[PDB]
Amino acid sequence: SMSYTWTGALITPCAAEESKLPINPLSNSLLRHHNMVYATTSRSASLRQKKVTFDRLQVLDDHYRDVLKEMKAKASTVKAKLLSIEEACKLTPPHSAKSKFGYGAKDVRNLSSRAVNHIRSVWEDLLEDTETPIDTTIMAKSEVFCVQPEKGGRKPARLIVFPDLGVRVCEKMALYDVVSTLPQAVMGSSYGFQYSPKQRVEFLVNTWKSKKCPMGFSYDTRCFDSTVTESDIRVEESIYQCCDLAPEARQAIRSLTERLYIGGPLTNSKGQNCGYRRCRASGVLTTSCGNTLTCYLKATAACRAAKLQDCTMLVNGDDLVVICESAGTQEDAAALRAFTEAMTRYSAPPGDPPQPEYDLELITSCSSNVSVAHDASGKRVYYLTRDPTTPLARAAWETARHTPINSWLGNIIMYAPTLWARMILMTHFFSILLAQEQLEKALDCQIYGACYSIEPLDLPQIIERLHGLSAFTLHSYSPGEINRVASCLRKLGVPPLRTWRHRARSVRAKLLSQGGRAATCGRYLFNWAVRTKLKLTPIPAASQLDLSGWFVAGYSGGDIYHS
Ligand SMILES: CC(=O)N1c2cccc(O)c2NC2=C(C(=O)CC(C)(C)C2)[C@@H]1c1ccc(OCc2ccccc2)cc1Cl
């Protein structure tokens, strides 16, 4: 069967769509090669549609059934609570897509009569109706990238598939507790979204150093979402059903599985029948948990199939990394090829074939690799970094255009110890915010899929929790990391690092002059910029922070808001 069938109706935008980075004094001071930065539009959806649409073969085996039973066994431990309409509405992003039936997200959040009645009747319908496919909208997602030269040229838009707001709320009631509890209970330390940045590094390094002779690799599946079959989604349901559930939750999940998750009709922004999905929806609550469970299931089974020895794996939706015991290079290569063949049979064929890796720093997972610097006292300190091209492009875009999500802020938070986040992102964005007296103004970003509202002035204490004091004192980055950043900047026409130091000195002064919370940013975020460096003791209010819901689960596509 096919991931998708199409009527021929176009995937239509519902606004004007911007695709060229503007010429702007502020974005130009970050990045000069503006013609290299673009945003995807629905104009390219057609191309994505081809890519995402294919037939699937899935042959299951005993390794699969064994691993499933073992997961269900752990799932059986869970007891999951039904969320109230109150809690579920408060999880709705303030700018979430309005319902087709009058109300929008503000009315959900205010618990207005229209929204709540509509939500109750959607809920009743999930209990009464077992079969009717629920409708979904299909939109071309606008994301910013840098042009890739002789690599492809330009990326076509990604596609998001989501149900109406009413349903989205009813999903949270039935499932928010499950998707944010079950994956941990099932996969234990292999569940990626449980780790803060510092914890992810520890886990990767400890696992690596714990192996007698480590070999590692990552595995990129070609369109994970389109390769998810309806068996997979039913199997995923079977895991959920092992939870103690309130009866209304149980029916809700059941109806939601047959009616929404397993597949259904697609409609374009103009109300026209677009086609039919028989694979994972990118834009539902279970998308992240479902993908993580499925990736883990298939991957664990395929390990058993390839007889990889003492495997530790770390899964974040479709992103998967394995670290195991080497058995020699020829034999490591053979086992890896067998592993792919097993994934391929489970319907998770690779994008590019996986490459056995013997140095932890040569492994990329979720765009990231471990790298090494030293702290003030000079000790080696591992930390996660990435190629800064995409972040920098997105930052330029966000500096030029008001956008709902500030990826620059997310990148500062998640990649705070990196050379490029400290020297460029912080300098740039604190210089602007300072100029515009927006330091206190809160700003939306996403971490692990969920949406957070963060005040920039709270960044020092956030970074301390997420990374530890170390993140403000790192120096002597690896040659390879420095040169990646250096050439990245030449490519994009970002001023050289030398220039950012100069701009930082100015910014730091201006923050210290301001005193209070602003001055703390100056001291901590920009200590690297000065020669006569300040001693940095732990920030008191760091320990007072409530990051309770920050690194608990993944919610990519799931319409989730924290504050
Ligand atoms: C789409 C998505 O949810 N993710 C993702 C997955 C694969 C790839 C990928 O690039 C991302 N990207 C991002 C993620 C964010 O949380 C926000 C941010 C701005 C950092 C971008 C997030 C992500 C990023 C890194 C990541 O793992 C490596 C890492 C963790 C902590 C600190 C540094 C590195 C995992 C995820 Cl889910």
Side-chain angles (χ1 to χ4, degrees), residues 92-128:
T92 303
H95 301 308
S96 212
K98 57 180 174 150
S99 173
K100 301 180 278 250
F101 307 105
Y103 74 101
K106 51 131 65 284
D107 310 297
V108 163
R109 295 188 63 76
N110 303 343
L111 308 176
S112 87
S113 299
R114 193 105 206 287
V116 305
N117 293 337
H118 275 70
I119 291 156
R120 292 220 214 73
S121 68
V122 169
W123 180 260
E124 240 307 280
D125 179 80
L126 257 28
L127 300 201
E128 290 164 314

Coordinates of all heavy atoms in Angstrom, one line a residue, residues 92-128:
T92 N -2.4 24.5 24.9 CA -2.6 25.0 23.5 C -1.8 26.2 23.3 O -1.9 27.2 24.0 CB -4.1 25.2 23.2 OG1 -4.8 24.0 23.5 CG2 -4.3 25.6 21.8
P93 N -0.9 26.2 22.3 CA -0.2 27.4 21.9 C -1.1 28.6 21.7 O -2.2 28.4 21.1 CB 0.6 27.0 20.7 CG 0.8 25.5 20.8 CD -0.4 25.0 21.5
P94 N -0.8 29.8 22.1 CA -1.6 31.0 21.9 C -1.8 31.3 20.4 O -2.9 31.9 20.1 CB -0.7 32.1 22.5 CG 0.1 31.5 23.5 CD 0.4 30.1 23.0
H95 N -1.0 30.9 19.5 CA -1.2 31.2 18.1 C -1.4 29.9 17.3 O -1.1 29.8 16.1 CB 0.0 31.9 17.5 CG 0.2 33.2 18.2 ND1 -0.8 34.2 18.4 CD2 1.3 33.8 18.7 CE1 -0.3 35.2 19.0 NE2 0.9 35.0 19.3
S96 N -2.0 28.9 17.9 CA -2.4 27.6 17.2 C -3.4 27.9 16.2 O -4.3 28.8 16.3 CB -2.8 26.6 18.3 OG -2.4 25.3 17.8
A97 N -3.4 27.0 15.1 CA -4.4 27.2 14.0 C -5.8 27.1 14.5 O -6.2 26.2 15.2 CB -4.1 26.1 13.0
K98 N -6.6 28.1 14.1 CA -8.0 28.2 14.6 C -8.8 27.0 14.1 O -8.5 26.3 13.1 CB -8.6 29.5 14.0 CG -8.6 29.7 12.5 CD -9.3 31.0 12.1 CE -9.2 31.4 10.6 NZ -10.4 32.2 10.2
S99 N -9.9 26.7 14.8 CA -10.8 25.7 14.4 C -11.6 26.1 13.1 O -11.8 27.3 12.9 CB -11.9 25.4 15.5 OG -12.9 24.5 15.0
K100 N -12.0 25.2 12.3 CA -12.9 25.4 11.2 C -14.3 25.8 11.7 O -15.2 26.1 10.9 CB -13.1 24.1 10.3 CG -11.8 23.6 9.7 CD -12.0 22.2 8.9 CE -12.0 20.9 9.7 NZ -10.9 19.9 9.6
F101 N -14.6 25.8 13.0 CA -15.9 26.0 13.5 C -16.1 27.2 14.4 O -16.8 27.2 15.4 CB -16.3 24.7 14.3 CG -16.1 23.4 13.5 CD1 -15.1 22.6 13.8 CD2 -17.0 23.1 12.5 CE1 -14.9 21.4 13.1 CE2 -16.8 21.9 11.8 CZ -15.8 21.1 12.0
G102 N -15.5 28.3 14.0 CA -15.6 29.6 14.7 C -14.4 29.9 15.5 O -13.4 30.4 15.0
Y103 N -14.4 29.4 16.7 CA -13.3 29.6 17.7 C -11.9 29.3 17.2 O -11.7 28.5 16.3 CB -13.6 28.8 18.9 CG -13.4 27.3 18.8 CD1 -12.2 26.7 19.3 CD2 -14.3 26.5 18.2 CE1 -12.0 25.4 19.2 CE2 -14.2 25.1 18.2 CZ -13.0 24.6 18.6 OH -12.8 23.2 18.6
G104 N -10.9 30.0 17.9 CA -9.5 29.7 17.7 C -8.8 29.5 19.0 O -9.5 29.3 20.1
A105 N -7.5 29.6 19.0 CA -6.7 29.2 20.2 C -6.8 30.1 21.4 O -6.7 29.6 22.5 CB -5.2 29.1 19.8
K106 N -7.1 31.4 21.2 CA -7.3 32.3 22.3 C -8.5 31.9 23.1 O -8.6 31.9 24.3 CB -7.4 33.7 21.9 CG -8.4 34.0 20.8 CD -9.4 35.2 21.1 CE -8.7 36.5 21.2 NZ -7.9 36.7 22.5
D107 N -9.6 31.5 22.4 CA -10.9 31.1 23.0 C -10.7 29.8 23.7 O -11.5 29.5 24.7 CB -12.0 31.0 21.9 CG -12.0 32.2 21.0 OD1 -12.3 33.3 21.5 OD2 -11.8 32.0 19.8
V108 N -9.9 28.9 23.2 CA -9.5 27.7 23.8 C -8.9 28.0 25.2 O -9.3 27.5 26.2 CB -8.6 26.8 23.0 CG1 -7.9 25.7 23.9 CG2 -9.4 26.1 21.9
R109 N -7.9 28.9 25.1 CA -7.1 29.3 26.4 C -8.0 30.0 27.4 O -7.9 29.7 28.6 CB -5.9 30.1 26.0 CG -4.9 29.3 25.2 CD -3.6 30.0 25.0 NE -2.9 30.2 26.2 CZ -2.2 29.3 26.9 NH1 -2.2 28.0 26.5 NH2 -1.6 29.6 28.0
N110 N -8.9 30.8 26.9 CA -9.9 31.5 27.8 C -11.0 30.6 28.3 O -11.8 31.0 29.1 CB -10.5 32.8 27.2 CG -9.4 33.8 26.8 OD1 -8.2 33.7 27.2 ND2 -9.8 34.7 25.9
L111 N -11.0 29.4 27.7 CA -12.2 28.4 28.0 C -13.5 29.0 27.7 O -14.5 28.9 28.5 CB -12.1 28.0 29.5 CG -10.8 27.4 30.0 CD1 -10.9 27.1 31.5 CD2 -10.4 26.2 29.3
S112 N -13.6 29.7 26.5 CA -14.9 30.3 26.1 C -16.0 29.2 25.9 O -15.6 28.1 25.6 CB -14.7 31.1 24.8 OG -14.9 30.3 23.7
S113 N -17.2 29.6 25.9 CA -18.4 28.7 25.8 C -18.3 27.9 24.5 O -18.6 26.7 24.5 CB -19.7 29.4 25.9 OG -19.8 30.0 27.2
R114 N -18.0 28.6 23.4 CA -18.1 28.1 22.1 C -17.0 27.0 22.0 O -17.3 25.8 21.7 CB -17.8 29.2 21.0 CG -18.2 28.8 19.6 CD -19.5 29.4 19.1 NE -20.1 28.6 18.0 CZ -19.6 28.5 16.8 NH1 -18.6 29.2 16.4 NH2 -20.3 27.8 15.9
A115 N -15.7 27.4 22.3 CA -14.6 26.4 22.2 C -14.9 25.2 23.1 O -14.8 24.0 22.6 CB -13.3 27.1 22.6
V116 N -15.3 25.4 24.4 CA -15.4 24.2 25.3 C -16.6 23.3 24.9 O -16.5 22.1 24.9 CB -15.5 24.6 26.7 CG1 -14.3 25.5 27.1 CG2 -16.7 25.3 27.1
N117 N -17.7 23.9 24.5 CA -18.8 23.1 23.9 C -18.4 22.2 22.7 O -18.7 21.0 22.7 CB -20.0 24.0 23.5 CG -20.6 24.6 24.7 OD1 -20.6 24.2 25.8 ND2 -21.3 25.8 24.4
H118 N -17.8 22.9 21.8 CA -17.3 22.3 20.6 C -16.3 21.1 21.0 O -16.4 20.0 20.5 CB -16.7 23.3 19.7 CG -17.7 23.9 18.8 ND1 -18.6 24.8 19.2 CD2 -17.9 23.8 17.4 CE1 -19.4 25.2 18.2 NE2 -19.0 24.6 17.1
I119 N -15.4 21.4 21.9 CA -14.4 20.4 22.4 C -15.2 19.2 23.0 O -14.8 18.1 22.8 CB -13.4 21.0 23.3 CG1 -12.4 21.9 22.6 CG2 -12.6 19.9 24.0 CD1 -11.7 23.0 23.4
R120 N -16.2 19.5 23.8 CA -17.0 18.4 24.5 C -17.7 17.5 23.5 O -17.7 16.3 23.6 CB -18.0 18.9 25.5 CG -17.3 19.6 26.7 CD -18.1 19.2 28.0 NE -18.0 20.3 28.9 CZ -18.7 21.4 28.8 NH1 -19.5 21.6 27.8 NH2 -18.7 22.4 29.7
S121 N -18.2 18.2 22.4 CA -18.9 17.4 21.4 C -17.9 16.6 20.6 O -18.3 15.5 20.1 CB -19.8 18.3 20.6 OG -19.0 19.1 19.8
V122 N -16.7 17.1 20.4 CA -15.7 16.3 19.7 C -15.4 15.1 20.5 O -15.2 14.0 20.0 CB -14.5 17.2 19.3 CG1 -13.4 16.3 18.8 CG2 -14.8 18.2 18.3
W123 N -15.3 15.4 21.8 CA -14.9 14.3 22.7 C -16.0 13.2 22.8 O -15.7 12.0 22.7 CB -14.7 14.9 24.1 CG -14.4 13.8 25.1 CD1 -15.2 13.3 26.0 CD2 -13.1 13.2 25.3 NE1 -14.5 12.3 26.7 CE2 -13.2 12.3 26.3 CE3 -11.8 13.4 24.7 CZ2 -12.2 11.5 26.7 CZ3 -10.8 12.6 25.1 CH2 -11.0 11.7 26.1
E124 N -17.3 13.6 22.8 CA -18.4 12.7 22.8 C -18.4 11.9 21.5 O -18.7 10.7 21.5 CB -19.7 13.4 22.9 CG -20.6 13.0 24.1 CD -20.8 11.5 24.2 OE1 -21.7 10.9 23.5 OE2 -20.1 10.8 25.0
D125 N -18.0 12.5 20.4 CA -18.0 11.8 19.1 C -16.9 10.8 19.0 O -17.1 9.8 18.4 CB -17.8 12.9 18.0 CG -17.8 12.2 16.6 OD1 -18.9 11.9 16.1 OD2 -16.7 12.0 16.0
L126 N -15.8 11.0 19.7 CA -14.7 10.0 19.7 C -15.1 8.8 20.6 O -14.7 7.7 20.3 CB -13.5 10.6 20.4 CG -12.2 11.0 19.5 CD1 -12.6 11.4 18.1 CD2 -11.5 12.1 20.2
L127 N -16.0 9.0 21.6 CA -16.5 7.9 22.3 C -17.6 7.1 21.6 O -17.7 5.9 21.7 CB -17.1 8.4 23.7 CG -16.1 9.1 24.6 CD1 -16.6 9.1 26.0 CD2 -14.7 8.5 24.6
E128 N -18.5 7.8 20.9 CA -19.6 7.2 20.2 C -19.2 6.6 18.9 O -19.6 5.5 18.6 CB -20.7 8.2 19.9 CG -21.6 8.8 21.1 CD -22.4 10.0 20.7 OE1 -21.8 10.9 20.0 OE2 -23.6 10.1 21.1

